[PDB]
Design a binder for this molecule. Structure first.
Ligand SMILES: Nc1ncnc2c1ncn2[C@@H]1O[C@H](CSCC[C@H](N)C(=O)O)[C@@H](O)[C@H]1O
Length: 258
């Protein structure tokens, strides 16, 4: 048994209203009221389609991942990671792929800066299409379960997916939903040995998930990095100024790139 699983159990034991408070406790939020209000009205212009744009922003503006070349966005959902990549100096093709359909997030068409370089496909399942060439590989897949055993298999499927997609020097950002289970640790140590990078916690993540992202330009003992987060997440159960701090939302320009 791990320090993560302790966290998981305490989390699971929470009152409905107690969990809602834990979730936002001392996190970083993104200011989305107006951007969402604009989208509801048609505006295709300056708005990130989701808070993922801001979320990826954070890794990128710190050179943890430098999208370049042909970017594949596995599970692009609405499109927040892709449209944000679309505007990035070093970037040529953005290809975003996602399930969509009833009960899943569908890609929203946007005219943001570099939109013309972004193509997003709904109706695809990625675990069952063939790997393609790419320079930057992104992946935000991993559905949360109260049962950590579940999360570990979901997380395992994902890494096993990404491997098949990766070559040498590939820029990458992958959600590892449950990095604390011992099966996931094991896989990650391998993956790191073979590919580099470390796991990093994004301050925009809620306290109710123990997600960390495997990002390419970083280093660090996996085990230790997972633990300092389980510790962090446990410490936040007992918190005494539990407001969130807010960032203004990414503004993603408009119009076309050549
Ligand atoms: N096997 C699969 N194939 C394609 N899409 C999948 C998938 N499993 C999960 N997904 C999709 O992956 C998405 C990840 S969450 C979307 C976040 C996105 N980066 C953004 O910033 O908006 C979900 O919307 C889900 O529908």
């Amino acid at each position: 048994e791990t320090l993560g699983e302790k966290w998981k159990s305490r989390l699971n034991a929470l009152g409905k209203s107690e969990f809602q408070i834990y979730k936002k406790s001392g996190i970083q939020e993104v200011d989305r009221t107006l951007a969402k209000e604009g989208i509801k009205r048609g505006e295709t212009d300056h708005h990130a389609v989701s808070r993922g744009s801001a979320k990826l922003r954070w890794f990128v503006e710190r050179n943890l991942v430098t999208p370049e070349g042909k970017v594949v966005d596995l599970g692009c959902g609405r499109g927040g990671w892709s449209y944000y990549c679309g505007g990035l100096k070093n970037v040529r093709e953005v290809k975003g792929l996602t399930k969509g359909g009833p009960g899943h997030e569908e890609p929203i068409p946007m005219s943001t800066y570099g939109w013309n370089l972004v193509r997003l496909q709904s109706g695809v399942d990625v675990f069952f299409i063939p790997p393609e060439r790419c320079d930057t590989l992104l992946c935000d897949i991993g559905e949360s379960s109260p049962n950590p055993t579940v999360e570990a298999g979901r997380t395992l499927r994902v890494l096993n997916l990404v491997e098949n997609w990766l070559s040498n020097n590939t820029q990458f950002c992958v959600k590892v939903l449950n990095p604390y289970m011992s099966s996931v640790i094991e896989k990650m140590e391998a993956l790191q040995r073979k590919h580099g990078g470390a796991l990093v916690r994004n301050p925009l993540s809620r306290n109710s998930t123990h997600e960390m992202y495997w990002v390419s330009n970083a280093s660090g003992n996996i085990v230790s990095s997972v633990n300092m987060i389980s510790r962090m997440l446990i410490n936040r159960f007992t918190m005494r100024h539990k407001k969130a701090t807010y960032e203004p939302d990414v503004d993603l320009g408009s119009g076309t790139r050549n």
